[PDB]
Design an enzyme around this catalytic site. Structure first.
Site, PDB file in Angstrom:
ATOM      1  N   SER A 177       0.783  -1.284   0.000  1.00 47.78           N
ATOM      2  CA  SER A 177       0.000   0.000   0.000  1.00 47.78           C
ATOM      3  C   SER A 177       0.830   1.362   0.000  1.00 47.78           C
ATOM      4  O   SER A 177       0.578   2.406  -0.630  1.00 47.78           O
ATOM      5  CB  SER A 177      -0.970   0.018   1.183  1.00 47.78           C
ATOM      6  OG  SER A 177      -1.660   1.255   1.239  1.00 47.78           O
ATOM      7  N   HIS A 233       3.706 -13.317  -0.527  1.00 45.20           N
ATOM      8  CA  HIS A 233       3.445 -14.738  -0.303  1.00 45.20           C
ATOM      9  C   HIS A 233       2.405 -15.268  -1.290  1.00 45.20           C
ATOM     10  O   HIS A 233       2.517 -16.400  -1.770  1.00 45.20           O
ATOM     11  CB  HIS A 233       2.990 -14.947   1.139  1.00 45.20           C
ATOM     12  CG  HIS A 233       2.944 -16.380   1.541  1.00 45.20           C
ATOM     13  ND1 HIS A 233       1.856 -17.188   1.270  1.00 45.20           N
ATOM     14  CD2 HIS A 233       3.853 -17.163   2.166  1.00 45.20           C
ATOM     15  CE1 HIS A 233       2.093 -18.401   1.737  1.00 45.20           C
ATOM     16  NE2 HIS A 233       3.299 -18.416   2.278  1.00 45.20           N
ATOM     17  N   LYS A 261       8.474 -22.671  -5.106  1.00 50.57           N
ATOM     18  CA  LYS A 261       7.842 -21.436  -5.557  1.00 50.57           C
ATOM     19  C   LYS A 261       8.671 -20.728  -6.617  1.00 50.57           C
ATOM     20  O   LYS A 261       8.120 -19.962  -7.424  1.00 50.57           O
ATOM     21  CB  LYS A 261       7.595 -20.538  -4.333  1.00 50.57           C
ATOM     22  CG  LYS A 261       6.644 -21.252  -3.324  1.00 50.57           C
ATOM     23  CD  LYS A 261       6.343 -20.531  -1.990  1.00 50.57           C
ATOM     24  CE  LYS A 261       5.216 -21.302  -1.246  1.00 50.57           C
ATOM     25  NZ  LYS A 261       4.715 -20.718   0.035  1.00 50.57           N
ATOM     26  N   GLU A 310      -6.089   3.624  -2.143  1.00 53.27           N
ATOM     27  CA  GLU A 310      -5.339   4.879  -2.251  1.00 53.27           C
ATOM     28  C   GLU A 310      -5.117   5.297  -3.704  1.00 53.27           C
ATOM     29  O   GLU A 310      -4.980   6.493  -3.977  1.00 53.27           O
ATOM     30  CB  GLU A 310      -4.011   4.784  -1.491  1.00 53.27           C
ATOM     31  CG  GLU A 310      -4.179   4.607   0.029  1.00 53.27           C
ATOM     32  CD  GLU A 310      -4.892   5.769   0.739  1.00 53.27           C
ATOM     33  OE1 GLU A 310      -4.856   6.931   0.265  1.00 53.27           O
ATOM     34  OE2 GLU A 310      -5.474   5.519   1.819  1.00 53.27           O
ATOM     35  N   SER A 366      10.742 -14.282   9.115  1.00 48.51           N
ATOM     36  CA  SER A 366       9.531 -13.887   8.399  1.00 48.51           C
ATOM     37  C   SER A 366       9.606 -14.217   6.914  1.00 48.51           C
ATOM     38  O   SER A 366      10.658 -14.152   6.285  1.00 48.51           O
ATOM     39  CB  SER A 366       9.272 -12.394   8.559  1.00 48.51           C
ATOM     40  OG  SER A 366      10.260 -11.649   7.880  1.00 48.51           O
ATOM     41  N   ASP A 367       8.454 -14.538   6.327  1.00 47.09           N
ATOM     42  CA  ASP A 367       8.442 -14.686   4.878  1.00 47.09           C
ATOM     43  C   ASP A 367       8.842 -13.377   4.204  1.00 47.09           C
ATOM     44  O   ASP A 367       9.524 -13.381   3.176  1.00 47.09           O
ATOM     45  CB  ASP A 367       7.068 -15.148   4.374  1.00 47.09           C
ATOM     46  CG  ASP A 367       7.090 -15.417   2.863  1.00 47.09           C
ATOM     47  OD1 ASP A 367       7.522 -16.514   2.455  1.00 47.09           O
ATOM     48  OD2 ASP A 367       6.740 -14.508   2.080  1.00 47.09           O
ATOM     49  N   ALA A 425      -5.351  -3.958   0.582  1.00 48.61           N
ATOM     50  CA  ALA A 425      -6.506  -3.068   0.526  1.00 48.61           C
ATOM     51  C   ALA A 425      -6.071  -1.625   0.301  1.00 48.61           C
ATOM     52  O   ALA A 425      -6.626  -0.914  -0.549  1.00 48.61           O
ATOM     53  CB  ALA A 425      -7.310  -3.181   1.815  1.00 48.61           C
ATOM     54  N   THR A 480      13.106  -4.022   1.919  1.00 49.13           N
ATOM     55  CA  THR A 480      14.054  -3.722   2.987  1.00 49.13           C
ATOM     56  C   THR A 480      13.946  -4.683   4.163  1.00 49.13           C
ATOM     57  O   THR A 480      14.526  -4.418   5.227  1.00 49.13           O
ATOM     58  CB  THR A 480      13.849  -2.292   3.514  1.00 49.13           C
ATOM     59  OG1 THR A 480      12.550  -2.206   4.124  1.00 49.13           O
ATOM     60  CG2 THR A 480      13.946  -1.270   2.397  1.00 49.13           C
TER      61      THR A 480
END
Lengths: 336, 331, 336, 331
Positions: free
Chosen positions: C78, C261, C302, C110, C288-289, C105, C281
């Site tokens: 976003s 993901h 993937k 936006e 974390s993914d 979203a 970054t």
């Protein structure tokens, strides 16, 4: 093969079991557990006796420090001496648990200044303009008044007078480590890291010792009493000799920059440290030495290929007291 | 106010317009635009006519803005070595501060190259093949053998000059000498000594040059490097400046030492930082410029800028839009 | 073997040569150069014709979008739609340079709101209390007035009335992608990403479309006009089908979270993307993914094992316009 | 005010005192101490006696503070799964928000374990051996085969109940059902459904559960998951709360969705974030709590805290000093 499983608080708050469960928790909790293992390996090695042959070789330095089976290098950045980790470091030095210190100028002077006046809690977001107008200096979320450095100046200038006199009339050849030992002797305060380091014959290296308030004061002092020389070449020989004649070495490095690179470079002289733990928040992607993984240092020969080094990616203010609790503090009786 | 708006590629590709649009793009693109403005303010001030040598002990003439450029060792291993060399070649900055690696790797690059690799290469295999890793760069061991052979006769002369010609060596004096000796226009330090741009590096022993000094001292003892006189030299550069600007790439001593010198004049007038460090661990490396304001290292009326980015990406773009546009004024 | 060498400004400011020199500059400049190569590989593949056999297989979807030899998935967070990168993304979509969009979203709403009222430059350090008191909301160093959302409400509510009516009287089965297409058609403005996406039959997936102002407004709307359903299961079939019947796929992922993901998971259905560029970054160390290297995704299937994926560790507001300048913009004529 | 001072190990090792000393140690240790204070404020408020079900469409009784707990998928792959399960088992939080991975990996852990590995393991070799990497964790492919076998008959029942019993499925309703089905007290979602703690996950299809729903739909078509009703459910939890607190581990939708629900009441009363994201790229994940204040997602009079740290390290320590000390009050 080891399964992931976190601490189950249905057992109650068993703090020792909670800390041990970090090893199977994953991500940096697992690296914390690995760091505990690596530091305990350094300690177990340190407490092994020297054989006749090992003793002969380790004795080949002109250092007063008693020989042990693992020479441990502890490096830390200035911010950590401003923090409460100053107390953690002082404890290790007080009880001869490490053998060589490396730090920055700020890491020297802020220990001494804390014996004269305290550092206070603040916030990262405090604005510089209003702080400056009130004579307050910001260090992260910590605060130090300007007057702290006035007190430092009053304490330090008479010592600089003596050091210049000893250089000019008694042939003293000053280096950063010799100056830090003298300042620790002068501060004469058991809350000081450098007091304990000089009492215990733990050398402190800081090749950029001039980069801070101590340097400022040497600078001003030199216009009324000129000629003080700090040689960095002799100090390079001294740190390198500690690595070359060690039976084993361990590196515990908090943060980046010179403290990290200088300890690792000394250990290149022996073909690598046997044990190594890094704790810092730097990342590798910009190519900096500060953010390099331990395995970069393996390519250079700064860490041995058969070593099992560990980096914990975390603020050392969180992790280092926990690490000490699980390692050195458990063997306190052996160091007394 | 100013509305956000990015570059519209329906215009085609004008690179100058694309870089200008960073200012209104937001986040670190906006900080890049701000950095361009600050560096251009430094340059424009430096070019203002002026109306010293004994108090600074320097032969370099004063200008209306003394610019300090600081950078870490990795940036000299990188291609940013060429960017820095360009600025120094054309006398666009006044004082350099770097780490030991940032001195020696410029000199070694005149003897042998650095190569591209990958961050993920494993240390065991590299060590077995005599290759050292620097991020995603690689340097063979032989580079340091060539450096040793080149340096040892120079160290011999330095000791002789100390003991019989009264030379009092410091890091900056040694770096000037090594730049003169390398005698190669690809070298940063060759150009710095030619243009009388001093280089400060208080921990000059923390690297391969240190290694070489160490080994050499057992064949030819006695070399002394004093850091105190170099503190006087850098501090007086700040004290007697008309205005100062700081351009600092990375953290550690290069950042703190430039800022400490400017504390001596109660602050730099302009300041641009480019680094990837973050504040939350309390480190000086990661501190925002506004921390330096609280100390007096940056003036309260200054408008300092930090770009949170790898300087290998950003610094060539910054030079393209600032110093390299003013090339004619510097000749 | 390739030597390190930076751009030499003694040649003057030759911008194209300066950008090409990133590849031999090192650290993330080199990764930028590698990203240019990877994206140009996607584009060169996309412009290859489909053979008879490839055409038969690629045609096995009920999608209106013309077949190409490389289906390119573009994901973005976003904040990038609040930034000027909105214009970069709109350009790619306008000229059919990518085939599937994934965003959050905020990344939908936006874009639409920017057609009604602008976003402004601010500063990261502005304090929330004073902003809130002035009805100003902060997005990094950007600012949006409260009234932006009032304008959005006035625009959106009559459309929600129609969507509920079409659901209840015409059997429409809404999903996030179908809603985004309708909103793009309604905004009817060539500055909008989603206007161009629906015009060009580029589907937009956003399985958590309710997590933002558009959801807020659906929520309020539902008390006066109840019953709107957004099904995420049909949209999963739709995105997965785009990957399964692609001849080749490329992923260009800006940021982390669901956009990263979900694109990667769609490509697991075909046993991996052929090309992939990440720009973010985030760092790997917390597991974390979002911060995982591309090579983590290789372990899952993937990303194909024979792919040469690239991550550029940088703020995409700096890098993505440069990347587009060196890749898609150079082949604009082919896409028109 | 307060002076800086660390724990003195000359006292020996009292772990409670060691953790308490973090408050005066500085940097993120100080933020940890602040987080303890904020979570304890949430708990103490929650335990205040109170003097709803139709407007929230929830059977869960109101307390004096509704606590939202959000966490990313990686934390459920980690040992923090046990930490979260403990809080949910003892009804210490009121609303959970997580990603799809954060649902499915809790369920799969009841069928087969996750293992320790290393971040540097190469994808090619792992893929050739049927092993998937999650940071420095590892899960065999077979884990997902077991998950498929377990889930397909449940999906059959869900479709039958939708088509003949009028069930209108949403993610939270599905997560409740899966927790009831797994019927294992090691599972977070087993305890959440037993204690009527709803779980929101608007992108529930973005993961292996999505994969399974997808495959299943070609054998048994028609399952619908509506996200709109789940927005009404989470938003009404915030709207009709007496007070709210947010405890958010990580970024992305779990952070934004909890904060958006609290915007509906013009802000949370208490908030603690633990994550490693940084602000400079403008991301919501990396934004300081004070950004949320500008929106009204956190009240202006709140005292929110962010700890910049890996939650695998910090969250068990935080629970030890907060919820686990109040265990008796929650029984």
């Amino acid at each position: 093969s080891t399964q992931v499983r976190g601490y189950d608080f249905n057992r109650g708050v068993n703090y020792r079991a909670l800390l041990e469960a970090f090893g199977t928790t994953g991500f940096q909790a697992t690296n914390f557990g690995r760091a505990v293992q690596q530091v305990n390996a350094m300690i177990e090695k340190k407490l092994e006796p020297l054989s006749q042959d090992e003793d002969q070789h380790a004795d080949l330095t002109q250092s007063r420090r008693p020989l042990t089976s693992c020479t441990i290098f502890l490096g830390y950045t200035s911010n950590l001496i401003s923090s409460g980790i100053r107390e953690t470091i002082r404890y290790l030095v007080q009880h001869n648990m490490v053998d060589v210190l490396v730090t920055t100028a700020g890491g020297v002077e802020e220990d001494l200044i804390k014996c004269l006046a305290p550092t206070y809690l603040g916030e990262f977001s405090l604005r510089g303009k209003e702080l400056r107008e009130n004579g307050i200096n910001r260090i992260g979320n910590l605060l130090v008044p300007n007057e702290n450095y006035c007190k430092f100046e009053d304490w330090l200038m008479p010592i600089l007078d003596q050091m210049v006199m000893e250089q000019n009339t008694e042939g003293v050849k000053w280096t950063p480590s010799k100056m830090i030992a003298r300042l620790g002797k002068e501060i004469n305060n058991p809350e000081s890291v450098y007091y304990w380091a000089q009492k215990n014959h733990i050398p402190v290296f800081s090749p950029a010792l001039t980069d801070g308030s101590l340097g400022d004061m040497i600078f001003f002092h030199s216009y009324k009493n000129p000629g003080l020389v700090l040689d960095i070449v002799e100090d390079l020989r001294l740190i390198n000799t500690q690595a070359i004649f060690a039976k084993c070495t361990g590196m515990i490095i908090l943060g980046g920059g010179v403290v990290k690179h200088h300890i690792a470079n000394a250990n290149l002289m022996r073909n690598g440290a046997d044990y190594a733990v890094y704790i810092n928040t730097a990342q590798e992607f910009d190519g900096s030495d500060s953010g390099a993984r331990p395995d970069e240092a393996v390519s250079w020969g700064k860490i041995r290929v058969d070593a099992q080094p560990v980096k914990v990616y975390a603020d050392a203010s969180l992790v280092f007291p926990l690490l000490v609790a699980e390692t050195f503090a458990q063997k306190m009786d052996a160091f007394m």
